[PDB]
DNA sequence: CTGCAGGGTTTTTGTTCCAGTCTGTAGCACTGTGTAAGACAGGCCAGATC
């Protein structure tokens, strides 16, 4: 459990606020960027290396066959682990255009060819959606369940803009919660299903999801309409079976109070619940672990990494995780002229 | 009584010019608001491979 500061000598521009860690096939790759796709990179996506302390960005290629993403800024990314037919498969919808918008068509994101030296090609595919098609929003999570045996999609939370007959060019960039109600989505064909809560009368967002064994769990998500971060934990079970995907819910008494987390793999099914934001001024210093059986959750806090004044008088911070018990945070920078890297990254590191 | 023409009448309203005295615009050369990164082509080297 240990940070080591990280210089972004080149290209510390590209990062943004919101942004996404794709952790495919060893290397990650960072998705989402500042503006538009300049012609140094007329795809999107970057190749992120770190070594000796340095944070290398490199360039990476699409298919002949693949269409094209915009810098999607806080999209909800679902990773579709290796299995029949074509892994490793990310799912990632919907989010935010650079143009300020909101998408509501899913992409899948995969890996083709290599290298031949060094170098990784991708393949992107829009996934066109029968529906019943859940409405264009951010932030919302998406969970992979496999269940006797097959698999699916679990869709859940999020915010939108104010309803099409109500926005007024004043309150434009006003936004809501979009109704509670959860939808199971195929991952081929695009047949989506929208199904009712009867336990959960109101949507969140920011909410870290982990999905186990066709077992959802949604940690705290931030509420807007009470402006609560609850404390409770939601568990839902997904029985998938001809031809009706019947959807049952409960609740856990107590899990943390945390939004935005960065949720890092270590173990099998054990991840560590890395920090955000528990109040609007108060960030998450402690870091959590969190491993998940059937039981249900177990949850030990452990000792939180020794933070640099810096990242422990930050006003806001955020990340990724690079996987294998790491992970990614960045802190934005004050000074005149400037810096004019906005960033300083930190990688921290379990055991 | 009226009508209109055309007489005089005063009082504007302006009529010529040269000393001035004063007021308002023209001539001079020049101002400031145009204020950042990104595309592209070539050289080359380092790490991967047979």
Request: hydrophobic content about 30%.
């Amino acid at each position: 459990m240990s940070l080591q500061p990280l210089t972004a000598v080149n290209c510390g521009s590209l990062v943004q606020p919101g942004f996404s860690l794709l952790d495919l096939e060893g290397d990650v790759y960072l998705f989402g960027q500042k503006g538009w796709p300049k012609r140094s990179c007329p795809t999107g996506i970057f190749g992120v290396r770190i070594k000796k302390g340095e944070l290398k960005l490199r360039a990476i290629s699409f298919s002949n066959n693949s269409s094209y993403l915009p810098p999607l800024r806080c999209p909800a990314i679902a990773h579709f682990e290796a299995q029949d037919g074509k892994p490793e498969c990310y799912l990632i919808h919907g989010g935010r255009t650079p143009n300020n918008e909101l998408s509501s068509s899913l992409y899948m994101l995969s890996v083709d060819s290599r290298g031949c030296n060094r170098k990784v090609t991708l393949r992107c595919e829009e996934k066109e959606l029968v529906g019943d098609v859940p409405s264009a929003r951010y932030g919302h999570t998406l969970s992979v369940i496999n269940s006797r045996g097959k698999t699916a999609c679990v869709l859940f939370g999020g915010r939108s803009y104010m309803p099409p007959t109500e926005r007024t060019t004043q309150n434009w960039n006003s936004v809501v919660d979009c109704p509670p109600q959860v939808y199971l989505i195929d991952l081929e064909f695009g047949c989506c299903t929208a199904h009712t809560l009867p336990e959960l009368t109101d949507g969140q967002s920011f909410h870290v999801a982990l999905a186990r064994q066709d077992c959802v769990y949604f940690l705290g998500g931030h509420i807007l309409s009470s402006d609560c971060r609850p404390s409770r934990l939601i568990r839902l079970h997904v029985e998938l079976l001809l031809g009706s995907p019947v959807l049952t819910c409960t609740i856990l008494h107590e899990g943390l109070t945390i939004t935005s987390a960065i949720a890092s793999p270590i173990g099998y099914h054990e991840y560590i619940i890395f920090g955000g934001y528990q109040s609007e001024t108060q960030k998450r210093m402690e870091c959590t672990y969190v491993g998940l059986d059937d039981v249900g959750v177990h949850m030990e806090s452990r000792e939180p990494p020794q933070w640099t004044s810096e990242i422990s008088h930050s006003r806001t911070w955020f990340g990724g995780s690079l996987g294998k018990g790491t992970a990614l945070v960045a802190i934005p920078s004050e000074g005149n002229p400037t810096p004019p890297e906005a960033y300083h990254f930190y990688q921290v590191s379990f055991q």
